[PDB]
């Protein structure tokens, strides 16, 4: 059971998808979408 829940949605060039995960460094993770080193949840990615 979950206390507060958010879905965040956005579009990524595939080779950067490896920056969404915690603490990593690079353009998407530094200037577009950073998630904290202390968060609970999941990252879903698929082609479009």
């Amino acid at each position: 059971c979950f206390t507060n829940v958010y879905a965040d949605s956005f579009v990524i060039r595939g080779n950067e998808v490896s920056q969404i995960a915690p603490g990593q460094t690079g353009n998407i993770a530094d200037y577009n979408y950073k998630l904290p080193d202390d968060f609970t949840g999941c990252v879903i990615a698929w082609n479009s």
């Binding site: 603490g23 990593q24 460094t25 080193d37």
Partner: protein
Amino acid sequence: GAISSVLNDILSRLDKVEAEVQIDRLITGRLQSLQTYVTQQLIRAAEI
């Protein structure tokens, strides 16, 4: 078992996720060196 004994060397060369576990090894090892010293001191204090 860490990459280095110099803490800012680790933090400069490795990312937050990897750097943390390298420091952990250093925390676990150093904290063992203190418990050893304090146990040796508590035994040496008893014969004094």
